[PDB]
Symmetry: C3
Subunit: 40 residues, 3 copies
C-alpha cells in the first residue's frame, strides 16, 4: 500500500536516502541511492 | 523550473516512492524506484 | 551518518529531484532522477 513517509534522511558516507514509513510496527523504511554534493 | 514537493509516500507493493508536487492542478507526482524493507 | 532532509524540490524540465540537507553550512544536497506524470 502507499503509506506516508514521516521522516527522510540522507547518509553522507553511503549516498543512501532513508525514508521512514508510517505503517505497522514503525520499522519499515524505503531506501534509494543518491548523489550528494556541496552547491555554490 | 523548481517544483516543490508537498509530501511523499512509498509503496511496498510497487517498490516506488511517490512525491506529490505543488504544481498545476495539484495532480502531478514524481516517482522513483526504491527498496522497501523491515529493519532490525 | 544520516543527516536530515529539510525539503525536496523536483525540476519540471529534467525531472531531477533535489533534497536539501541540514548539515554544516546549509549548502549540501542529494539528487536523483524521477519520472513525473499527471494522475487521475
Amino acid at each position: 500500500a502507499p503509506v506516508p513517509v514521516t521522516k527522510l534522511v540522507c547518509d553522507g558516507d553511503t549516498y543512501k536516502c532513508t525514508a521512514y514509513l508510517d505503517y505497522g510496527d514503525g520499522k519499515w523504511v524505503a531506501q534509494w541511492d543518491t548523489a550528494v554534493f556541496h552547491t555554490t
